[PDB]
Amino acid sequence: QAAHLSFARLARRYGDVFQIRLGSCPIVVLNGERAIHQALVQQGSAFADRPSFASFRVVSGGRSMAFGHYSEHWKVQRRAAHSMMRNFFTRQPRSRQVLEGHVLSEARELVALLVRGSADGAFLDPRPLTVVAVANVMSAVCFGCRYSHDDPEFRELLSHNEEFGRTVGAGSLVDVMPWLQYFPNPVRTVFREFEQLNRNFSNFILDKFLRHCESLRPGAAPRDMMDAFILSAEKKAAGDGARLDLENVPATITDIFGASQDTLSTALQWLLLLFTRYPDVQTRVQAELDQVVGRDRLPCMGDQPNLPYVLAFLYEAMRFSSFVPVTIPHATTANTSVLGYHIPKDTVVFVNQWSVNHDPVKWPNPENFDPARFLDKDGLINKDLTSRVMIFSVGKRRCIGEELSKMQLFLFISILAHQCDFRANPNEPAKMNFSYGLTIKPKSFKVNVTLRESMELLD
Ligand code: HEM
Ligand SMILES: [N-]=[N+]=N[C@H]1CC[C@@H](c2cc(=O)c3ccc4ccccc4c3o2)CC1
């Protein structure tokens, strides 16, 4: 009973394009490959605008990029994030290394703690470790300051993600039915909780905005991304390519932290769930890692073209999961048409990512987890097929960390596979249930982690 599912069904009789009406507001639901790539690439900028949904106006003081309406103050606000998304990593040799280093740093902590909780045949919820973990990499990049797995106030700040999904997830009732906010019942709850955890993110980050402003005394080289965005805006204040005004630097860092922490936490959940619930893909990835790099030395980002399965799993996991099944709802700039069907200006729009990744005219074994799906005859990755899984979206509103988030999940499992052993609790029958909202996060699932051969992570 999650919205990604029910649109491909509605599509079958009514069209790859059709239009539901949620409460009052009119949704157009793009479900093909052909639908989406027409709409968002070929008619892009005609769909690059966001709903007039006022939960979006809650996010990051209303100055969010994720949820912001498409315009020229938004142009430079995306242009400045991405060209920081692209610039930070790669400006000079080893730009990636300091990032790479955090993943290893944290990977060593994860397998330490995963193994810690799991001794004596035990099993444990890997959830609250993989978010402390994933959020540290991004807090070391953004704020130059990781957080311990002791800190209950940090773990707090992270323990409300299922809320932020639900509220602004496509399929929802907090924006499109304003009549529901006068009385107790799920839809009243789910939004009031939502306004709470946005307060606590934008209070947690405008916080780091002050102290970094307190830090950077003109004779300086930016020692953070928080810094780098302020150096960016303090250079667009007292003189004259992509540079914000300060007033949006709190908001734009918030989106880049809040995004990553939630999604990359999910992604890294799902992969463990695919090793536990498909033992023999764990085996392959775990083997091919061994041969290509060795037991002798733990694996690094160099190894990537030389690891065709660990990509071919990464990608099938992406597809099968489709853990972002419906992108942050788009809206229209001017008029348009998709597969003929004429779609009026400012109409609300959804984008079904699960209906690119599960169309069985394009994707044969659609609900089978099959990584080796992505594999050439002589055994290679096959760039042709692999570049058609829809999960980061496309055209004007596509994801800007895609580049980064791939390099974070690759390492993270290239360590975890190569260092640890993952067991599904055999006493867990009725299947791995979920909890849908923007993202598809597994419900409490339990895993036993033994070390393969000592700890090589210790520097
Ligand atoms: C596996 C990891 C990730 C996935 C699957 C993912 C997926 C997505 C999706 C589906 C969207 C919406 C696209 C649309 O509405 O057209 C999006 C937007 C966004 N993502 Fe991600 N994302 C991931 C990681 C990250 C990370 C690490 C960051 C930090 C850079 C990030 C920052 C953003 C931002 C700022 C937006 C808003 C872009 C915009 O509205 O124009 N994402 N992402
Ligand atoms: N999968 N997927 N999609 C994207 C992932 C997350 C992106 C995002 C952007 C923000 O600005 C933001 C802000 C405060 C948040 C507070 C708690 C949790 C999350 C937050 C958050 O998340 C938007 C959608």
From Swiss-Prot:
Effect of substituting residue 398 to W: In GLC3A; allele CYP1B1*25
Tissues expressed in: Expressed in heart, brain, lung, skeletal muscle, kidney, spleen, thymus, prostate, testis, ovary, small intestine, colon, and peripheral blood leukocytes. Expressed in retinal endothelial cells and umbilical vein endothelial cells (at protein level).
Regulation: Enzyme activity is increased by liposomes containing anionic phospholipids, phosphatidic acid and cardiolipin. Inhibited by naringenin with an IC(50) of 5 uM. Enzyme activity is increased by cytochrome b5.
Keyword NAD: no
Annotated effect of mutating residue 366 to L: In GLC3A; allele CYP1B1*23
Result after altering residue 444 to L: In GLC3A; uncertain significance
Cofactor: heme
The EC number(s) this enzyme carries: 1.14.14.1, 4.2.1.152
Pathway listed: Steroid hormone biosynthesis; Cofactor metabolism; retinol metabolism; Lipid metabolism; arachidonate metabolism
Disease connection: Anterior segment dysgenesis 6: A form of anterior segment dysgenesis, a group of defects affecting anterior structures of the eye including cornea, iris, lens, trabecular meshwork, and Schlemm canal. Anterior segment dysgeneses result from abnormal migration or differentiation of the neural crest derived mesenchymal cells that give rise to components of the anterior chamber during eye development. Glaucoma 3, primary congenital, A: An autosomal recessive form of primary congenital glaucoma (PCG). PCG is characterized by marked increase of intraocular pressure at birth or early childhood, large ocular globes (buphthalmos) and corneal edema. It results from developmental defects of the trabecular meshwork and anterior chamber angle of the eye that prevent adequate drainage of aqueous humor.
Function: A cytochrome P450 monooxygenase involved in the metabolism of various endogenous substrates, including fatty acids, steroid hormones and vitamins. Mechanistically, uses molecular oxygen inserting one oxygen atom into a substrate, and reducing the second into a water molecule, with two electrons provided by NADPH via cytochrome P450 reductase (NADPH--hemoprotein reductase). Exhibits catalytic activity for the formation of hydroxyestrogens from estrone (E1) and 17beta-estradiol (E2), namely 2- and 4-hydroxy E1 and E2.
Protein's name according to its UniProt entry: Cytochrome P450 1B1
The organism of origin for this protein: Homo sapiens (Human)
Organism ancestry: Eukaryota, Metazoa, Chordata, Craniata, Vertebrata
